[PDB]
Each structure stands twice: as structure tokens, then as C-alpha cells.
Amino acid sequence: NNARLYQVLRGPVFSEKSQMLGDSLGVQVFKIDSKATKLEVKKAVELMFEGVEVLKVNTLNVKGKTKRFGKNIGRRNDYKKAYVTLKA
Amino acid sequence: PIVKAKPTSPGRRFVEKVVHPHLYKGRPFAALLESKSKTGGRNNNGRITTRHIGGGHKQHYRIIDFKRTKDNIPATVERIEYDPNRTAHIALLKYADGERRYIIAAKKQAVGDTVMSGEASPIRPGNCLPLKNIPLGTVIHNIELKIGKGAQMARAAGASVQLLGRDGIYAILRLRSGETRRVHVNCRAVIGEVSNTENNLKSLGKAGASRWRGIRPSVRGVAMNPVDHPHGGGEGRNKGRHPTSPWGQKSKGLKTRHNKRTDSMIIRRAKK
Amino acid sequence: MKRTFQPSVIKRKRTHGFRARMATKKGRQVLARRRAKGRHRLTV
RNA sequence: CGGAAGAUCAAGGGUUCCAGUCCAACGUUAAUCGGGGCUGGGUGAGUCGACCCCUAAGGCGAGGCCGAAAGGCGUAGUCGAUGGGAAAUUGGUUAAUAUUCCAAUACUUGUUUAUAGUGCGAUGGAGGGACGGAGAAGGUUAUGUCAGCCUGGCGUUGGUUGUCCAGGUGAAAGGAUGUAGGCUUACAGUUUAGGCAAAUCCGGACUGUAGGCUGAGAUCUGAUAGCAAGGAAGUGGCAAAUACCAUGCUUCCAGGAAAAGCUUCUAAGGCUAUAAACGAAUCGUACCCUAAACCGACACAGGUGAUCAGGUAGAGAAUACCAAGGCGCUUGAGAGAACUCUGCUGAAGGAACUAGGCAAAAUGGUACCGUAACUUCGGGAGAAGGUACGCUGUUGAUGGUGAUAGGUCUCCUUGAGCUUUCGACAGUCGCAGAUACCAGGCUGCUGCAACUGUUUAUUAAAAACACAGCACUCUGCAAACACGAAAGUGGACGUAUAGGGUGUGAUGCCUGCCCGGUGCUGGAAGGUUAAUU
């Protein structure tokens, strides 16, 4: 439907990899739902940034790090991020 | 025949192998084959229920027609093959209608001859006949015990039975064990003696030749401790006890036959 | 020298795992006993 | 160090990976450093692997069988990889990912639409997939080495513009082609005791007519890529794998997975070509992995499967020195006693040591000569014991590859260049030429066990166990025997030339007497004898 595509993109990634990729290949890096396929991401980007056409989507699951605090051992959420290529 | 090996190695000094240059050097007929994995002499409980089994060479099962229910249809011996599942050789049959089967091979049976099954069949090695259509005194093998069940007795290399006579609806036979036996006259048998008559004549030569056949070493009971065998125990060498199996059963003459329903099918045995 | 543990994940989950416990009457008694003690680790 | 202490993984671990920052604790010392603390970043796939389809051992197992209960077994099935089943390589790029990103060039498999032609369809039938050990002769390549070519250099000390020195320099998958090899008569027709029914498909029986499949590598294309000093080269010889041809070939017995994918046939009742567009999900991907990250409580001298495999010598994956790459093993500084450990050398003697030549010393290579008792004729045997070995020059013989010519991935003769293996003669230097590392000590008598093997993980490796062979005995098949409570199993889809138990233990010569005891086998005249009545 069109009420599940609003929850596919969790937020853009701001890093040296994401900033270097944009300037050279114009590929947006996003943090996506833990259940979003490559098709859902493709259908979420083009609906929600009108005027762009996605060539490909490269997804990956990256695991959260164990960051201990105080007396406890705790881990960060795992998350999924996608590289999406837009038509030049 | 037998061929002694030259003593080029200590393991080859007493290797006397049986050699048959007339048996197929190719592969068995594919469709009459079945996968068959070793059991290590273990039952469905995973327990060793027969010792000294384990190892050996992988081998297929050849489906031997022990029944021979293709009567009045002639079959020609296509080839005589070696069988790893038994000591006897096996003849690849080629029935008129093209159906191919394996049977135990008679000693006097070559490639090209025709074999017959049924009641109106010639008395020649290979043919399968009911015991009433076989004249007395001929040498037979592949003896049936139940009607229609297939050959049970005299199926090993060199096996043969003497059809001594008839006393009604039974057929008096003299088995190679020396036991005279009556069998229903409607049961079938094959004419001739079983091939590979020089099998007992061989010599393995080395411990590894018995390992190739799936046989594991056997430890004498007097080489054990008393917690493992009744023969176990002793300072030095000693027997001390009457000979007995590891389960406590005499092994020097104790007769072990429990059947009381087949007791009337046995005429006598032989004393020597 | 070779030591006693020598881990294997498929072998661990197949002899001590959750589904291995639940496939026997006595394995379910193991799980019930871990739960009654309040253990945070039921199965390996 | 360099058959790793270098690289790629699997397992296992799980962020240890990269950067910035800090030095309390941790690191056997210090620490500004770290696999430590803290804060950020990092793992990109239709083609790699998993998942998926298929099955092995082995599980579970509608109904079924068995069992006080719990449960045990088992059919159809359904799971279960360590195996079978589709497909890409080169190069660049990040601090950290790369067959994933980017560039170039490919490949595999689907969906939808259209144009034609048109009998399609299986969980079933038949093919196929599909397989053992050893060995041998080749043909190759990866790779190496020299040469060519390009770019630099003219050398702190005699000489070095040359036949000099250094560095660099060889593009793959794929597509054409079809070679060295390997296999191999083809078609048509008639018909049918068979493949559980059916079948045009297989199998079987008859009648006429007379190169193909596979396949390394080379070649062409791919191919004006990329790659250094700021805009260069990029092609010839020789050598050569354990990798490929090759799941081949030849042999032997110990006789060599299964199932599916795939090709065909029909049973009940859409398919094949042509393209055009579109797609190929999800999970893993960092990093260690002969280890400081795994198993050993430790940053522990242990253990840990697979893959890659440079040079000079060398038979070699031994050994020595090096390459690429990676390290100096997380306390140092002194001194240079006894004593301890690990080594080197040792006058004269040479086992006098000692329980005992324990340890040490010694031998050690290749070729040729020569070699005893005894023997099962194989052996013993490398018995024992000798001689030669470096370098330089000349010279004889020889295998391979083959440019140039003479008579189309071709054939024949000649043979340049390179290379192989053997000799002879002459000279020459040293104490010493198998110069280093590496690398048998050998004999005589005698007990034991035939031998190869096995064993007390962690004080015993042996004469102990096993062993081929021998004997006795049991067992006629629902076999004896064994597991089990039984069902169900093994024995065995075996059948007395078989299977079990027991003893002995190759082989040669052999294996005497005793049946009183205790077993075992056979017999029943008599005596005694249970429940029961």
C-alpha cells in the first residue's frame, strides 16, 4: 500500500562514505527499515523525492556495537542501510 | 583356478587367489542394481549384534532372480559376472522378450547357451524345475523350501544337493551338511552344481585381505579379563573353564536347535 | 594438545538446542526446571 | 621467516577492522603505543556462499504394530550435507568493502507482450547424471628465465660509452575455430510373451541402404584497457608443474553412493521458434584464522581442516641463502665468579666408564667395481669393502625444441638459435672438490615372536593383542547367535565352499598315551522323582 512506504526510510546517513559517494556518483545513503526489501526502497525513494529515478539499490544489514555504560553491558540496535543510485 | 603369488613381499608369500578369465570385466547391468550400505553388524538399536563386521569395500546389490517365474520363455546367458554380494558367480540372462535378469550361475554354464524355466524344461545346468519333474540322482542347487518363495538352500560357490528320491508329496534330499531332508515336491530346484567350485581353495595371505572383505579382528576370550569373557582371567596363560562363548554358552558340542515345527522335515543327519 | 571442547554450532544446537529439548518428554522437564529456577538462559 | 613467522578461506570467535582521542585499570617493565577506555565510521552481489531443488548416513514419522504408564519400532512420507543441481573476468577506487562499488567486455535464468507454427500434459516408464584403487605415455598451460623494447645512469676506490649497470615492460572471462588427445558404424522400415497400465520413447527379433561426438592448449577477436619518471615500451627463444586434456587411457580385484535438475515417452485430463520490454528476492560479506582475536583459566614454546606455492643450488613441498610480503617473538642495562643448561675444541690413551658404550663421537651422496653364511629362491644386500668426484681448455656421442629454405591450427628433408644426457684427453689450485646445510655406522653368536600392523591418552610398545593359516564344534533358514520388555532388528536381501562360538597362530618336520573326574553327544532296562488328582 501507500501507508507502508512512509516507514521505509528511517533517515539519511551522514558520513565520509556517504558524502564522498554523493559528490562523485550521486548515490543517496539512507537508514532504512529492518524489513525493507530493495523493491520497497526503490518504491519509497521515487514516491518521496519526486523527480528522481532509482537505478539500483544496494542494501546491507549492519550490527549494533556493544557499548557498555555504568555497571551494565548493553548493545546498540542493529540497523539496515541502503545505497540508492539516481539517474544523472 | 588357483594361482600362487610370488614371495616378493611377506604379505604376498601366501596369497592364493581364485582367477576366472571367462567372467565379465565390465560393469554390472545398471537396472538390476541397488544401493547397499554397510551396517557394522549393528541393529536398529545401534548395538553390535554380530561382531567382527565393519569396514570393507563399497558394493552394490545385484538383484538375483531366486524365483525364476518366467516359465516357458527361453533366456540366453548374456554374460557371467562376478558378484561381491556372494561367493557364487551370476549369469546375466537375456529372455526372448528382451527382459534381463541375474541368476546364480551353474558350474557347467557358459555364455550363449539357453536356459529354461518351468515344468517342460530340459535337464541341463541352469534350468529351473519343480522337484517332481527332476529324475532321481541328478545334482541340483537353488532349492526352494516354500512354494513360490525362491531358492533358499545350496546357493554358495560349489553348492550341490543329491535328490535321493521321493516318498509321496515330499522329495528326499541330501544336503552338503550331511543332513537328509524332505521338501515338498512342488518346490523348485536348478540343475547342476554352483560355479566357483575352487573358492574354499583360496588363501587370503595377509591380514589386510580380510579387512578388505568387511571383517574386523577377533580377540580370543582367554586374551581378556574375567569382566569381559568367562575365559578371561589368569596369571599367564590359562583356560580354567569349559570352552564357552562370551555369553556363557558351551562351544564344544552343545547343540542349539529350538525348532519344533520343522522337526518332521528332517530324516536324519550324518555321523563322522 | 587437542583439548576437550572443540566447538561446533550445528552440533551444539542439535544436541542441546531448544528444539532438541522440546522433542522429548525429559527435555521438556529440563526446560521446566530451568524456568522454575528463573534462569535467563534456557538452552545453549 | 620466506611449503612461512607471506597470502585465501572453512570452523570458531564477534567488532578484535579504520580513524580521532585518553593512559587510571589491562599489557608480566615504561608507554606518547595497543586486540585497553571513550567517541564516530566501516561490511553494497542475478554470477562468491547461504537460502532454494535433490538426496546419503541418520532422524521424525497420518494410518500400522508392540508395550503397566512413560513410551519402543515402523510404512507412505517428511527432514537431514560432509555430496549432486544456472551463470564474469580483468582493471581502478576507500583510512577501512570489493568477482559486490565504478569502467570495459560477458554470461545464466525468468515474467509479460506480440508474430507465426502447433498435441500439450506425471509424483509414472526409459535415458542421463553416475562416480573404485593403482599405473603409464604424452600434449599443454600457470609459472620461471634469458633475450628484445622503454626509461634512467656513467659511479666517494683501480677500471666502467659498453658484449656496461638499474628499474620497468607480456590484459582476462567470453565469442569464433576445432588442434594434440579420447570415444565411435549411421539411417530407414516391419514387428512385439518385456519396461506394473499406455507409449511414436527404451528393450527384443528381422529386411535394405553406406565421417560424427567430445576435447586441453595454440591462433583470431575481445583489445586504441590499465600501468612510471609527466608523457614509454608492451614481443621472441628456452625451461616447466603435483594444475588442465583426464569422470580420459591401460590394468587389477577388494568390484567401486543416491536422488533430483536435464532429454524423451505417453496416462488420467498448453507448447516450440522470433524478438521487445522488464526482472532475478532474502541472508552473509568488516577482521583474526600455523592465532595475542579459535580450543588450552594467561597476549600460554601445545593443538587446529582446506587453498596459493617465486629465485639460486638441489631428486625434492628436504636443506641453505634470498624475493613479494611480514617480522625482531612487551622488561632492560651491566658484569663476565662458583654452579646449572645448551654448544665448540682437546695432548696421550681409547670403554679402563657404567647395571648397560647411556650419552657422545663416528658413518652418511652419486656412479662404477665387489660382496659371505644361510634361504621360503623373493631375499639376505646399501651385506662387508673399495675407486672417482673441484675448476680450466680442447674434443667425441646424443635426446628435445625448432627459425631459414625446398617439395593448410597439416605432412616430409635440411637444419640457425636455445637446451638435455653421457664420455675422452690435457692442464691447474688447495690440508681438504659428495668441501657448507643436508646426508646409513657396520659385523659374529644366541633367546623370543613368522612377517606389515595394535596396545596401557598421561611412568610398561613388548615375548603382550591382532594376523593370514589350522582344528573342533554349532547352525537346514523364522538358521545358530546377538540387541530388545515385545514389536522390530542385525546375522543377511547371506544359505553349510555360508554364518556363529572356541582354541591355536606363517612356514618346514610334526602333533604320543589316558574317557577314571568334570563337561559334551547318544541310549532307556531299571531305580528315584513336581505340580496335579
Numbering used by the authors:
A (entry chain Sn): 2 to 89
B (entry chain Cl): 2 to 273
C (entry chain Ba): 1 to 44
What does the paper say about this structure?
Here, by combining cryogenic electron microscopy, genetics and biochemistry, we identify Balon, a new hibernation factor in the cold-adapted bacterium Psychrobacter urativorans. We show that Balon is a distant homologue of the archaeo-eukaryotic translation factor aeRF1 and is found in 20% of representative bacteria. During cold shock or stationary phase, Balon occupies the ribosomal A site in both vacant and actively translating ribosomes in complex with EF-Tu, highlighting an unexpected role for EF-Tu in the cellular stress response. Unlike typical A-site substrates, Balon binds to ribosomes in an mRNA-independent manner, initiating a new mode of ribosome hibernation that can commence while ribosomes are still engaged in protein synthesis.
The observation of EF-Tu bound to P. urativorans ribosomes in complex with Balon was unexpected. The cryo-EM data, in conjunction with our mass spectrometry analysis, showed that about 44% of Balon-containing ribosomes were also bound to EF-Tu, the universally conserved translation factor known to deliver aminoacyl-tRNA molecules to the ribosomal A site during protein synthesis. To investigate the role of EF-Tu in ribosome hibernation, and to gain insights into the mechanism of Balon recruitment to the ribosome, we used focused classification to enrich ribosomes simultaneously bound to both Balon and EF-Tu (about 44% of particles). Domains III and II of EF-Tu are well ordered. The overall conformation of EF-Tu resembles that of the open state of EF-Tu(GDP)42 (root mean square deviation (RMSD) 1.9 Å) and not the closed state of EF-Tu(GTP)43 (RMSD 13.8 Å). Whereas Balon, aeRF1 and Pelota all use their conserved C-terminal domain to recognize EF-Tu or its homologues, Balon uses a distinct surface on its C-terminal domain. This alternative EF-Tu-recognition site includes a unique β-loop and is about 20 Å away from the corresponding site in aeRF1 and Pelota. The weak Balon–EF-Tu association is therefore stabilized in the context of the ribosome, possibly by the additional interactions that we observe between EF-Tu, the ribosomal L7/L12 stalk (protein bL12) and the 16S rRNA helix h5.
